[PDB]
Subunit: 316 residues, 2 copies
């Protein structure tokens, strides 16, 4: 109704992606089970993940108080200076280590750090703060067992896209606030995340069927993730209710121009900068939310990967 004509305003590069047909796929099951929707997502993501760098990969199950969680280690080189944990997006209800395969492999290539993807339990089966607890547990397990796994856990980082960016910064804040040391958090890489705004200029202007980010869609994802309405205000969900004026690790904040969540990125950055916390913001012109997946076809997506990777290594 009052929204911007986003499909006309996106870049010609972004449009080539949006207009790409995958003719071998069924239609999107908007009335199937969550289990079917997850399967479709995994199938549809495969084409975008093709051509990923080839490198040494290892999969391990790690213990958590909620049971074992799968992890995948991508090891570019034998003397990694740090370990980067990667939390994938998908609205908390979709996505896995395969949907984000190419992103995690390129991050490893461009950083020359070990990248560890965490297969956190999705919602609605898991509810807040379960994923964050699983991530912290995994991190802490790897830190205790670093020698056995052959990884450098002296310096770590958290990285993620969309809902995974929320998990990335919430994990770093959880570690800080609970006085948990599972390695020095050298940096956090946050591509088009959301951090607890309930409304904003960008949420009003943007969002539609092309990105699955209408007000209604956002309420749906919140309803799946939270168990109690009181959790809306938790400082590990509404991160703006946490104290962002001190002791935040260096954050690289990437905004998508035509994403309703962009203001979440601008508020985090403006908050951090006003309180002299180390950060950088960069807007990627012409993009929709979720663009990091499109690095093979979009120079802007590969640039965003390079930029985060390089921000991380600049902290080491």
């Amino acid at each position: 109704e009052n929204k911007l004509p986003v499909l006309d305003l996106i870049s010609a590069e972004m449009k080539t992606v949006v207009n790409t047909l995958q003719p071998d796929l069924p239609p999107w099951p908007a009335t199937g089970t969550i289990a079917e929707q997850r399967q479709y997502y995994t199938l549809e993501r495969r084409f975008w993940n093709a051509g990923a760098p080839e490198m040494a990969t290892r999969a391990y199950m790690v213990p958590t108080k909620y049971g074992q969680v799968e992890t995948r280690l991508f090891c570019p080189q034998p003397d990694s200076p740090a370990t980067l944990f990667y939390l994938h997006g998908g609205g908390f209800i979709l996505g896995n280590l395969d949907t984000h395969d190419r992103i995690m492999r390129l991050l490893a290539s461009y950083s020359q750090c070990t990248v560890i993807g965490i297969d956190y339990t999705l919602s609605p089966e898991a509810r807040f703060p379960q994923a964050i607890e699983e991530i912290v547990a995994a991190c802490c397990y790897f830190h205790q067992q670093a020698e056995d796994y052959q990884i450098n856990m002296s310096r770590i980082g958290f990285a993620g896209d969309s809902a995974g960016a929320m998990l990335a910064l919430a994990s770093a804040l959880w570690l800080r606030d609970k006085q948990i040391d599972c390695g020095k958090v050298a940096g956090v890489l946050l591509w088009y995340g959301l951090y607890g705004l309930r409304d904003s200029v960008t949420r009003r202007l943007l969002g539609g069927v092309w990105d699955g980010l209408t007000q209604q869609d956002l309420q749906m994802y919140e309803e799946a993730y939270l168990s109690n309405d009181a959790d809306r205000e938790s400082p590990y969900y509404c991160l703006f209710n946490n104290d962002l004026t001190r002791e935040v690790p260096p954050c690289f904040i990437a905004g998508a121009e035509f994403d309703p969540l962009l203001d979440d990125s601008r508020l985090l950055y403006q908050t951090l900068a006003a309180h002299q916390q180390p950060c950088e913001f960069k807007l990627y012109p012409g993009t929709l939310h979720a663009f990091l997946h499109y690095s093979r076809m979009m120079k802007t997506a590969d640039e965003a990967l390079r930029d985060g990777a390089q921000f991380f290594t600049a902290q080491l």
Copy 2:
């Protein structure tokens, strides 16, 4: 907490106002009745209203479906080209024709149009949408009785500050939506309004005891005005839920820099501009919310009045 240090960022001219003492006044009766708080605001406002333009004024009671309401006409010249209705601010719970006497007289003076202030019924005694219906009724009464009152009702406009600005645009949109012709709405003058955002970048960064615009203050004014949580979504409260893509009268939108409500103005402007609706935005640097009252002492407040007057007369 994560807020900006607003008292340090405001301009020197704004700080002179913030630091102005009225020693002869009692302290603000925070635990007193609404009646007491209203009387106090009235009293405290007198000093800021002094020295207003000399001009012919007349009070008239006008019929509405809720009873008679007081109006005040300010007549700057014998041949007014249009009539501007002025809706005062004060959070819906405070203010009256006296607290905004100087604003209205300056507006009439700079516009050279008749200004008609409307003493709409305050909340909690009235609830939404009573004030809007009162204003529409008053406007249609004056339109029907124009010859008797010696006013020009062939072109009209609505003007207001803060909550008053919400009433101004809501009234224009009501007339449009219900196809009520009580004069051609030439323009709407909106100083530091709010138009229904529930959260924003600016709501998070700003607001405090210095302006009475914390999240809890804002919730309390909304609670007083609205009968129902569902009314938060009404297209005459959340005006962003109304259609803003067609037939919106020319809007002058003035933002105050260090005001949590600034993004409400930015959103209204960006929305109207994106749909080719006629509008102008101007930011008034260094200011708090509610600065229009301080025109004797602050060039910027007086400039804001001139600017809104000039915009209105440019539509005639």
